[PDB]
Structure formats: structure tokens, C-alpha cells
């Protein structure tokens with residue numbers, strides 16, 4: 001079903017460790033290529049491990065070709081630091097497109113994050129061109145930051161309408177689906193929340209247009225989590241699966257599950273930390289296992305609005 005090219009960590013949930021349980025517990029046949037194998041994410045004090053290069057990635061895809069098992073339903077990628085690695089990935093995703101007409105490519109274009117004023121990049125700046133020029137033109141679903149969206153389109157978002165028009169710039173780039181997973185925009189409910197935007201432009205009979213758009217708002221949480229976005233794109237794959245043309249119906253359940261997972265995480269997290277000290281990166285690790293049930297059967301405790 002899915003060819004997930006992401007990272008692996010012995011401990012915690014980031015990358016492939018954040019996307020495989022779900023996609024699996026949902027019932028997707030997940031094939032995983034670990035871009036790196038680190039002992040834990042780089043937010044802990046120390047960390048060690050190895051990274052995979054372009055040839056090594058090449059090697060594994062090769063293996064899959066020779067056994068004629070290189071046929072995929074979906075392809076999911078995320079955080080990378082090697083421009084070459086990212087490049088190599090585009091080639092692969094192409095061919096895989098020739099075997100199965102359209103195995104949707106779900107791409108989380110991880111580049112950095114925003115705080116009210118501007119942003120802080122995670123990756124070196126040279127990756128920017130590749131995502132903009134080579135990557136995005138082939139992705140079929142993308143889940144960027146506001147920062148990330150701004151970096152791709154080159155346009156800075158100051159309001160909601162400005163936002164919808166930057167998504168369009170994205171659509172015409174290729175992705176018939178765009179979902180700004182978070183933003184600095186205040187929302188119709190106070191800074192007590194987080195706003196995310198969603199828009200899919202479904203070609204159709206011969207009017208040649210249709211474009212849907214909604215706006216979910218999740219109850220912000222008082223903590224710093226690593227991996228939330230990998231968990232996001234994973235489930236978005238699950239759900240937008242059952243409801244191809246229902247950009248609304250998906251996020252709705254996708255976002256739903258995260259509030260669950262997160263608060264149980266936060267809850268537990270605290271439970272562990274005394275009541276006058278910040279939980280460490282260690283205790284903040286997504287209680288993935290324990291959301292065994294939530295992830296599969298969501299309480300649609302969120303709702304949005306078309307436009």
C-alpha cells in the first residue's frame with residue numbers, strides 16, 4: 001500500500017515511528033524505508049546514530065524493483081536534510097507513478113516553524129529550491145506550516161484571505177490538496193486556539209472548476225511536542241482515503257484524534273513530572289500505543305466550515 005520514506009528512532013515517536021502504527025492500526029500495508037536510525041529525536045540533550053545517503057536509498061529501491069514488488073498505492077515522505085536524498089526521492093516517486101496510475105504522493109514539506117514575527121529553519125536553505133522546483137510539482141497532497149507555505153510561494157500571509165490565495169498558488173503548483181496545518185492567524189474563537197486551513201480543488205465535469213475550503217480550530221495545548229506533524233500527515237492519508245473528495249470530512253477526524261493523543265500525552269506527561277517543573281522531551285513523547293483506540297475510532301470533537 002504505502003511506501004513511507006522517513007526517519008526511525010529507537011525510542012519515541014517521530015518520522016516512521018509516528019506514521020507506521022497508525023497507518024497499520026487503520027489497516028494499511030506499510031512499507032518503511034528509514035532515512036536515518038537515530039537513538040531519539042534531536043530535541044533531547046544528547047543523541048547518536050546514522051543517516052542514510054542517496055546511494056543507500058537507491059540500493060533499497062533497487063532491491064524492490066528486481067523482485068517486481070515496486071507497486072504502490074501511496075507514497076509518504078517528510079523531513080529530510082540532504083538535498084540529494086530529497087532529489088533521489090523525487091526520481092523514485094516518479095516511476096512508482098508509472099506502475100500504478102496514481103498512487104497519491106503525500107508530502108509534508110518540513111522546513112521550519114513560525115512564531116508571530118517570522119521563522120526559524122530546521123534544514124539548510126538549499127533544500128528550499130528543490131521542494132519548490134522539483135518536489136512539490138509532483139506531490140498530490142501537502143501539509144505545510146504557514147511559514148512553510150510562505151517559503152514555498154514566497155508570499156507572506158497577513159490575513160485569512162491572503163492565506164486562501166497562497167494555497168491557490170500551491171494548487172496551481174500541483175497538489176489538488178493543500179492543508180495549512182497551523183498558523184499565526186488569530187481565529188474566530190480567541191488565541192486560546194490554533195487555526196488550520198484546508199482547500200482541495202477537484203477537477204470535475206466540464207465547468208473545469210470546484211475548490212473546497214474549510215477551517216478547523218484545535219484547542220491549543222500548553223506544550224512543545226516533536227512529531228505532531230508526522231502523525232498528522234499519516235492520518236490525513238488514512239482518512240482522505242475513505243473520503244477522497246471530502247477535504248472537510250477528513251481533517252475533521254484527523255484533527256480529532258490528535259487532540260486525544262496529545263492530551264493523553266500531556267496528561268500522562270504531567271502525571272510523571274512533579275507539579276512545578278516542565279516535562280522533559282522524554283516524557284512528552286506521544287503516548288502512541290495508549291491511543292490505540294482513539295486513533296482508530298475518533299470522537300469527532302471538532303468541526304469546521306466550508307470557506
Ligand SMILES: CC[C@H](CO)Nc1nc(OCc2ccccc2)c2ncn(C(C)C)c2n1
Nearest residue numbers: 007014015036041042043079110122226227
Ligand atoms: C528538527 C527539529 C526536532 C528538534 O526538536 N528534531 C527532530 N529530529 C528527528 O530525528 C531524525 C533525524 C535526525 C538527524 C537528521 C535527520 C533526521 C526527526 N525526524 C522527524 N522529525 C520532525 C520533522 C517531526 C524530526 N525532528
